[PDB]
Amino acid sequence: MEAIAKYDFKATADDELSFKRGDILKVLNEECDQNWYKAELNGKDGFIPKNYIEMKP
Amino acid sequence: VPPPVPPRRR
Numbered sequence: 001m002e003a004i005a006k007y008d009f010k011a012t013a014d015d016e017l018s019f020k021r022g023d024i025l026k027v028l029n030e031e032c033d034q035n036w037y038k039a040e041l042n043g044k045d046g047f048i049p050k051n052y053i054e055m056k057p
Numbered sequence: 058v059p060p061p062v063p064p065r066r067r
Contacts, residue, residue, distance in 0.1 A: 007059035016065070035063030051060040 002056035017046030
């Protein structure tokens with residue numbers, strides 16, 4: 001799916017990854033935390049919060 | 058001012 005960073009984000013742990021308000025993210029799974037999505041960016045993959053992004057199913 | 062990030066870790 002398609003994802004779009006809405007606000008800037010700064011990872012807090014090893015399993016999370018950063019972005020900046022505007023990144024085009026690759027949603028690689030979403031079934032484990034209603035509040036987080038696993039997506040791809042910048043040659044990495046990690047958790048990001050859903051209230052910081054907007055999907056584009 | 059962005060939103061309060063969810064508590065990660067269910």
